[PDB]
Structure formats: structure tokens, C-alpha cells
Design a binder for this molecule. Structure first.
Ligand SMILES: O=c1ccn([C@@H]2O[C@H](COP(=O)(O)OP(=O)(O)O[C@H]3O[C@H](CO)[C@H](O)[C@H](O)[C@H]3O)[C@@H](O)[C@H]2O)c(=O)[nH]1
Ligand SMILES: O=c1ccn([C@@H]2O[C@H](COP(=O)(O)OP(=O)(O)O[C@H]3O[C@H](CO)[C@H](O)[C@H](O)[C@H]3O)[C@@H](O)[C@H]2O)c(=O)[nH]1
Ligand SMILES: [Mn+2]
Ligand SMILES: [Mn+2]
Lengths: 288, 288
């Protein structure tokens, strides 16, 4: 459940937070709108796990495996079993054009998987973009009744370390690994005013990655509906945003600030970027 | 309103957050349960003001002025007019045994004051403690229908600097100025197991001050009801907690973690503690 009566935490023995010691001295851990930026060292997972288990939290995870991308599912799901929300209720939603071709991955207790058949678009750009419509079509069909939070990710990825309830919040985006140290002028936002995704050069907080966002079902419905409707306006006007759904996601999260931001620990590419000292954990990574 | 549909923020030009620069290097700015700890430098008030104004937020401020403490009201209210939630809708609730003795303080537009008559208890300890019952009696009478958030403070205080929408969240407490640098064993929690306020020596996050807490009306009703009911159990058992309502507040916030914590900028005593370098702002201070 979300927003229901919260019982009292049990007694717990853990290290005292020290008010006069920063938890990170190398990174920003809170946005200027007071949203936590989630890095290792910012959270005590034992406290968070208690809070979320006492609410009987169910997390849905959406992933699209269309055309040849079904090949990515086995590793994606096996590694999610090892690292994603372990101990909590999880419902995987695998959207595919090949519903008999989903690998038979063994799931832990309290975890289930549904296969949702969808059409395949010809262009990769359309496959990627149309996830927003498809996720929003499914909020009413399933998600409102089945889960508390939705996490929406790319499939060509693997979990390498813990991804848990520290991410859960009404609305989150994730810092794209290519831009976390960049100034806003260098962010690859859509820069043509003719597009609904347009962001001026003097605006922008962060460059969020299209491959990892989420929130409560209500907030994810809002985001995905808004991005789809913006895409359809652009289509009617003969323009396609430079980075497709990621461009629209960035416009949405500029105007509707997320209540948590995930660090690039949660969205990485070791082939392209190595393992900087600032990443204490590499949690969710590109398959090379 | 709270929890309603949020329109899009307008365009704003402000400094880009820098991911690789901490906002404070001298203090903890987020708790281990991912609640912001509010210090100067952690927030851009322009963004927050936009967010809260677009929700038509109304803030209630409760204050008790019983017996000789009516003398504190003039400065309290005049300085609140200068510093508390300026630009937002405010409703002051002055609880007093001398309802004709409230000073005539000139209020800004969108700000109003109600006087609520209550009984005076003989002992200062009972006057202080019974605020929890009185605040909880008034959630149903007025607060649910009149305000979005409640802020509950001591009267023998003055505002010296900005106290605004950065504090608003479902549930907050404030670091007591005498203990922010102390280890938990030194916190003056109730230590007798016979009291409902008991906290063992190996437990505790922070020592919260009784003089400044708040949250949504729903969360403040819960806190104040719980503290009152705990007090009544103690009374039946012939025990009074060492620091009265503050002891019960601390027990509640240990078991029900706040969603923001205010730094001691928000609760200070310059006579006793001076002006340390760690306090960039002294916002709400004891009258000496
Ligand atoms: O034939 C396809 C093409 C895409 N996809 C799905 O769409 C996702 C995104 O497409 P790609 O992985 O092909 O492209 P990128 O890795 O460049 O994706 C990045 O850029 C995209 C926009 O161009 C999206 O924002 C995406 O979330 C972001 O990680 C895939 O992971 C997969 O889930 C398929 O299932 N089949
Ligand atoms: O005769 C009185 C006594 C108290 N109060 C009200 O109760 C508040 C708290 O009492 P005091 O200010 O007399 O006592 P302290 O400053 O020591 O208060 C501190 O300790 C208390 C518990 O002992 C409470 O937790 C309080 O919030 C905390 O700041 C006052 O500010 C005032 O609002 C009155 O109105 N009249
Ligand atoms: Mn890809
Ligand atoms: Mn006092």
C-alpha cells in the first residue's frame, strides 16, 4: 500500500547519524528542491527496508523486449532476481511482440511475471518512443490494482549490485551517466523551439536518462501520458525530438521536479566510462 | 491543497545544480532514511515558493500563550509577519486563557488570526504537556478544513530570519540546539522503562526539540494524539516524563521517522550558545 496508516518501527540498533559529518563530501546528495540524490552512503537500507515492508510494498518493473531484444531478457531477469527489491513483493511486466519467447527464469518467493503482448514498430526510435503510450495504456489495465510503485527500464542492461527501496518515491529520474559532470549547455536536450520537448540553453537541472525512471503508479501514469501526448503533437507537426522519449522525459522532469534523483550508480556503461572513484557501486549497467 | 494535480512550473533561470559539488561540506544534509535536513545552502527558495504557491498552500501556526506568557505574543506575531511563510496563506491559531488580551498585530494580506480559548493548568509542565491534547482536539474542529500544514511552536521566541516553505513536508521535527553535536547516550531522552517515552541508551537518531514540529494536518493529528495518549498512560502509572511533551515527541519521532528534519537554524538560543560558524542563519530564537 501507499499513503496508509503506518505502524511503529521496531527497536533497531544502528550507527547514530552525525549531524556535523557530511555523508558524502564529493557529491551533491540533495537537489535545490530538497529531493534526495541517491548515492551509496546516503541511506541505511535496514531502516528503509523496515519502512517499506511494514507497508506491504509491491514494486512493478516494466521492460520492453521487442524484436531481437528478447535476447536480453534472460540476463536482465536473472540479475533482477539477484539484486532488485529482494525481500519485497515484485511484479515483472514484460512487454513483447514474441510472448512465447520469454525465457523461463526461476523467481524467488513473492515475485511474479506477466507477459503483455504488444505490436512491434519498424523503427527502433518508434519502439523506444511508444513505450510511453504502452505504459500509460497499462496503468488502468493492471498497474493501479497490482502495484504501489512502477520502475520503467531499458532491457539491454544487467543488475550488478543492489537496487532497492531507497529509490521509491512519488516520482524519480536517474542521472544519465554521460552528463552528470556536464554544464547544462552541453546537455543534449531538444533545442528546436518547434518541438514540445524544447528546453532553452539557460534552463535545466540535470540530464535524466530514458532508461530508468519511475514512481507511484499515479505519477508514472502522468509522466507517460504527458510524454506520449507531446510526442503526438510533434508527430502532427513533422518533428521528432533529437533523443526521442528521453527528450520528452527531460522536458517533463524540468517542469515537474522529481521527488528523488538517482545517481549514475543506477544507470552506467562501464565499457564507455570505466569505474570512476565517485561510483562506489555500479548497480545497473549496459550490456556491452 | 495537498496531493492534488500539480501544474507545470513556469520557465525559471537559476544556477545549475552541480552534481560533483556538495551543497554543504560541514554538515549532514540528509538523514539515513533519506529525509532532507534543512540548512541554508540546501534549497533554492525560488523553486520551492513556486511549487507551493501553485498548490495554493495554506499554513497554520499554533502557539499557546497561557497565563503570563501572553506577554510574548506581540513580538512573536510581529516577527512572524516579517519572516514566516511570507507570500503564502497563513492562519495563526492563538490558544490562550485570556482571549481578550491578545495584542492587535497588523497582518499582511492573506494572513489571518483566530483566538481559541482554553483552560490554564496550574503547573507549567501541565500547560506545556496539554498542548498535545489541545492541538489534537482542534484538528477536527478547524485545521482539517482550514489549512494544509500545521506548524506548532513555543511562544517565548522570535523570528529573526526566513522560515518558509522549505520546512513543509508530511512530518518534521527540529534538532534541539543543545544536542545537535552530542552522542545519543548524552541525549536527555526518558530513560525509565516505566514510562511510555522510554528510549534505551543504544537507540535514537536525533534529539528533537519540543518547541518546533509540524507536518500535514493528518500527520500532526497522529503525532499529537499519540503523545497525549502516552502521557495519559504515564499519568495513570504515576510517572511524568523527564522532559514532558518533548520526551514523548522524541519517542514518537524515533518510531515514526520524520520526512524532513530542520537544522538548529530553526530553533536556537543565542544567549546560551552564541553564533557558531555552522549556523549561517539564526531563524527562530529564544527571547532571553
Ligand atoms: O528493436 C527494439 C528497439 C528498442 N527496444 C526497447 O527500447 C529500449 C530503448 O532502445 P535502445 O536500447 O535500442 O536505444 P538506446 O540504448 O540508445 O536508448 C536510450 O535512448 C532512447 C531514446 O533514443 C531511450 O530514451 C532509452 O530509454 C535510452 O536508454 C530498449 O532497451 C528495449 O527495451 C526493443 O525492445 N526493441
Ligand atoms: O505558563 C505557561 C507555561 C508554558 N506555556 C506554553 O508552553 C510552552 C513551553 O513551556 P516553557 O516555554 O515554559 O518551557 P521550556 O522553554 O523549557 O520548553 C521546552 O521544554 C518543554 C518541556 O519541558 C516543551 O517541550 C517545550 O516545547 C520546549 O521548548 C511555552 O513556550 C508556552 O507556549 C504557557 O503558555 N504558559
Ligand atoms: Mn540500448
Ligand atoms: Mn520556554
Amino acid at each position: 500500500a501507499i499513503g496508509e496508516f503506518m505502524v511503529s518501527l521496531p527497536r533497531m540498533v544502528y550507527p547514530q547519524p552525525k549531524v556535523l559529518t557530511p555523508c558524502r563530501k564529493d557529491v551533491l546528495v540533495v537537489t535545490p528542491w530538497l529531493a534526495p540524490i541517491v548515492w551509496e552512503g546516503t541511506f541505511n537500507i535496514d531502516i528503509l527496508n523496515e519502512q517499506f515492508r511494514l507497508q506491504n510494498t509491491t514494486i512493478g518493473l516494466t521492460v520492453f523486449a521487442i524484436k531481437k531484444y528478447v535476447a536480453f531478457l534472460k540476463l536482465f531477469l536473472e540479475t533482477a532476481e539477484k539484486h532488485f527489491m529482494v525481500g519485497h513483493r515484485v511484479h515483472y511486466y514484460v512487454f513483447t511482440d514474441q510472448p512465447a519467447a520469454v525465457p523461463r527464469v526461476t523467481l524467488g518467493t513473492g515475485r511474479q511475471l506477466s507477459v503483455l503482448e504488444v505490436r512491434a514498430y519498424k523503427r527502433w526510435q518508434d519502439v523506444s518512443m511508444r513505450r510511453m503510450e504502452m505504459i500509460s495504456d497499462f496503468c488502468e489495465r493492471r498497474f493501479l490494482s497490482e502495484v504501489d510503485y512502477l520502475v520503467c527500464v531499458d532491457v539491454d542492461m544487467e543488475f550488478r549490485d543492489h537496487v532497492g527501496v531507497e529509490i521509491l518515491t512519488p516520482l524519480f529520474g536517474t542521472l544519465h551517466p554521460g552528463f552528470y559532470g556536464s554544464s547544462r549547455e552541453a546537455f543534449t536536450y531538444e533545442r528546436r523551439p518547434q518541438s514540445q520537448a524544447y528546453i532553452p540553453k539557460d534552463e535545466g537541472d540535470f540530464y535524466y536518462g530514458g532508461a530508468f525512471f519511475g514512481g507511484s503508479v499515479q505519477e508514472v501514469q502522468r509522466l507517460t501520458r504527458a510524454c506520449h501526448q507531446a510526442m503526438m503533437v510533434d508527430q502532427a507537426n513533422g518533428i521528432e525530438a533529437v533523443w526521442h522519449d528521453e527528450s520528452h522525459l527531460n522536458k517533463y522532469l524540468l517542469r515537474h521536479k522529481p521527488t528523488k534523483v538517482l545517481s549514475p550508480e543506477y544507470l552506467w556503461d562501464q565499457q564507455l566510462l570505466g569505474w570512476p572513484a565517485v561510483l562506489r557501486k555500479l548497480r545497473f549497467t549496459a550490456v556491452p
